[PDB]
Symmetry: C2
């Protein structure tokens, strides 16, 4: 069975960037729902003992009756799991990954500008991601709980732009939530993932 992870920090540890109340609803309600619905699909099946990354990377091979829930709920679980771990109260822009960002984009700010343009223009619910695609860094978006693993790309960083992730504090002002985000990225985690993927 899949389990809801504990937050690696207090619920109020990302203030004033993300409110305590949002961290509660986002983790204890929204993420918990994807996990529960995911378990209802996979529990008692072959898929319970497969890695979630393997399942999402090969959705096509999931039985037709289970596929939508693995996509949506399995996506939800994976996506929110990674998200908590790439946030940190002690965010410092440090890691070898950032040296490589700098090489491709010219400066970290030019990278932040692209990620911002993509995340503020993503229409409806979804995520903006930094990924490795054949040894190379690229910024992509997905709708809803879709995941770049399904397209052959490894995620090392992600940003939630479903409105539940920012509405209580920021309401319509997603660009401010983007600006806030940069202050809380666990780049140490981003870089562990980067070093594993390339």
């Amino acid at each position: 069975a899949f389990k809801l992870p504990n937050l690696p920090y207090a619920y109020d540890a990302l203030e004033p960037y993300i409110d305590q109340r949002t961290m509660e609803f986002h983790h204890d309600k929204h993420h918990n729902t994807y996990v529960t619905k995911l378990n209802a699909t996979v529990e008692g099946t072959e898929l319970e003992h497969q890695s979630l990354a393997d399942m999402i990377a090969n959705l096509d091979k999931v039985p037709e009756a289970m596929r939508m829930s693995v996509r949506n709920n399995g996506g939800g679980h994976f996506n929110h799991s990674l998200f908590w771990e790439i946030l940190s109260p002690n965010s410092e822009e440090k890691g070898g990954v950032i040296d490589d960002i700098k090489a491709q984009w010219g400066t970290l700010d030019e990278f932040k500008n692209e990620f911002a343009n993509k995340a503020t223009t993503l229409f409806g619910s979804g995520w903006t991601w930094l990924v490795v695609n054949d040894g190379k860094l690229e910024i992509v978006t997905t709708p809803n709980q879709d995941n770049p693993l399904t397209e052959g790309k490894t995620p090392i960083l992600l940003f939630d732009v479903w409105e539940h992730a920012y509405y209580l504090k920021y309401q319509n002002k997603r660009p401010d939530y983007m600006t806030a985000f940069w202050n809380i990225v666990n780049w140490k985690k981003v870089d562990e993932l980067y070093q594993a993927a390339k």
Copy 2:
């Protein structure tokens, strides 16, 4: 130019079903942004005097570089404009359309049950609709600001299930927002649209 229409009632006229704060943000910010972006797309161009309903229904004929803005922002203007008109503090379940809903579904409760099960299971952002398709009533969903006009169906009632429409008061509890909606449907307006469409 496209324009942000006024609300036909006070911002607190739909309390407690839709909260005052939500009406302030939904209309003055979200809908207003749809209008702003749409106008930035279309004027100084030969599309500056084309109606929304024309462009939405013939989205395949809008030029490639303007299509997404017209789809998304044009959708958002059409959809929210209709949404205000189909809300009312003086909701009264009466009309030709209500007689015909009962004829087709057996009872009004079964109409609502179908509409609600489509509203609550819509994954991500979008709308639930009552449409006329060849003189026949049916209930459909669209993602984001997509509109059944694009598929040649006429909308006569719609419900916004983007998280911005309900997060401040309901948070994750979409179904409680759905059940609340029935108390504020302007059935008189829905009926006018119905008699025009068939």
